[PDB]
Structure 1
Amino acid sequence: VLTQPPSVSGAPGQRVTISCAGTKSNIGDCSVSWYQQLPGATPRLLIYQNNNRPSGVSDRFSGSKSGTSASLAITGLQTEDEADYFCLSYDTSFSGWRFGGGTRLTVLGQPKASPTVTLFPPSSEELQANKATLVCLISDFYPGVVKVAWKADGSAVNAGVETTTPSKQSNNKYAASSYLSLTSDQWKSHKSYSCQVTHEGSTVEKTVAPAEC
């Protein structure tokens, strides 16, 4: 019921705004507060009662509210502002506090980078346990959002897929994994299996086959 865009971008030095769309029942009538959370870190209060800054919070951050929406503004954008930003408001219809979904702020700089994709077939050892895990490893992409699709022979594979959230590498690009979990019998009933990775409207795919050679 509090709606934030999932993602916002800005260039170093620029002004960005993050909005939280609500209704009369929350933002319209109640105090909005804003929280910043660096990756892996703890949330931190930035703004309370719509537009107040606690001490020790930079004057680059400011908050306002108009009608049923509220906005956090950030001037002189710096790389260390890369974080997830949340709004919070009581909601008198809900009779409870509601957080926005969070807006992840990206500070533009590093050029686009397409993923490296590595696909492994089940090992012989695992197949002897009547199991077969296909392992698709995805690395070196930027920005850090990918979509993974699996294919068996020609068709789409939905059952048995599990994919990690993208994580940061030491070289400032991103990584993810996806696992297709099968039985040995499943594995051997198709002649090809594919892992397809989509990054910025571009697709990279790998293919394995139970007939190794």
Structure 2
Amino acid sequence: SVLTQPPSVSGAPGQRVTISCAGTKSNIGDCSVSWYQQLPGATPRLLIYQNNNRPSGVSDRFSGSKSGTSASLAITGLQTEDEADYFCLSYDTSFSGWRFGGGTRLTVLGQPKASPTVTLFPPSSEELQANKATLVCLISDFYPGVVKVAWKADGSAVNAGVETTTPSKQSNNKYAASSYLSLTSDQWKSHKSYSCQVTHEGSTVEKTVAP
């Protein structure tokens, strides 16, 4: 990955951004560069090929220049739907092979704040027959994509047996996450009530279940 890209580039809605790709003469200086978009958790899509050319369908808001030992992808009229990962591509003669840039994550800022809608499920009776109990706390539709999860059992806090996923961008550019409290059936039956507490942008929000 001799091709150097900025790890992250941010932008406000409507503005223009630039994503640079730096390399040597062996690669970018002489050979053609192609640009690839990757919407979160999706398959890459050709954006630019041969330095400055657009395939059919690709928005005219996208464009690529190449000058010297460095290439760039410019995006005008930035929209939320442009939130993706962006890779450049080029052949290298000193390397004798094709190399991608490290990639660039694009974030768009103009989105409204959205509080988490928290859903908590008790263990199923089917699982309780297996002498096991899993509490499922599902968190979705929150922006910005940062939350903290804590488990309360009655009054005291819970640490052991907690597994929480990282936040992940949904299709609507909001974020989702999930937390699991894995207990034996008798752990579950022993306490009075369990609580999942999602903290997001100052305000903590709570959901609670019981046998």
TM, length-normalised to structure 1: 0.63
Structure 1 residues 147-156 or 84-93, which shifts more? Answer: 147-156
Q: Distance in 2 between matches of 1:146 and 1:112?
A: 13
Q: Distance in 2 between matches of 1:191 and 1:96?
A: 63
Q: 1:103 to 1:179 in 2, by over 3 A?
A: farther
Q: 1:117 to 1:128 in 2, by over 3 A?
A: same
Q: Distance in 2 between matches of 1:23 and 1:156?
A: 55
* CA shift digits 1:45-75 (9 cap, x unpaired): 2223444444654443222456765431111
Q: Distance in 2 between matches of 1:170 and 1:46?
A: 20
Q: CA deviation at 1:133?
A: 0.8
Cα-Cα RMSD: 4.7
Q: Distance in 1 between matches of 2:34 and 2:52?
A: 8
Q: CA deviation at 1:100?
A: 4.2
SS in 1 for 2:172: coil
* CA shift digits 1:68-88 (9 cap, x unpaired): 654311112245434432223
Q: CA deviation at 1:149?
A: 5.8
SS in 1 for 2:14: coil
Instruction: Work out the number of aligned pairs and report it.
Output: 210
Structure 1 residues 18-27 or 122-131, which shifts more? Answer: 18-27
Q: 1:170 to 1:8 in 2, by over 3 A?
A: closer
Q: 1:63 to 1:204 in 2, by over 3 A?
A: farther
Structure 2 contact 80–173 (Cα < 8 Å) conserved: no
TM, length-normalised to structure 2: 0.63
Structure 1 residues 127-136 or 140-149, which shifts more? Answer: 140-149
Q: 1:185 to 1:167 in 2, by over 3 A?
A: same
Structure 2 contact 40–169 (Cα < 8 Å) conserved: no
Q: CA deviation at 1:135?
A: 0.6
* CA shift digits 1:132-179 (9 cap, x unpaired): 111111133124454556677999978765556767779875443332
Q: 1:43 to 1:184 in 2, by over 3 A?
A: same
Gaps in structure 1 of 5+ consecutive residues: none
Q: 1:112 to 1:129 in 2, by over 3 A?
A: same
Structure 1 residues 98-107 or 124-133, which shifts more? Answer: 98-107
Q: CA deviation at 1:42?
A: 4.6
Q: Distance in 1 between matches of 2:71 and 2:150?
A: 37
Structure 2 contact 116–142 (Cα < 8 Å) conserved: yes
Q: CA deviation at 1:105?
A: 3.4
* CA shift digits 1:170-204 (9 cap, x unpaired): 98754433323343356578888664545457654
Seq. identity, %: 100
Structure 1 residues 165-174 or 7-16, which shifts more? Answer: 165-174
Q: Distance in 2 between matches of 1:104 and 1:88?
A: 16
Q: 1:39 to 1:203 in 2, by over 3 A?
A: same
SS in 2 for 1:134: strand
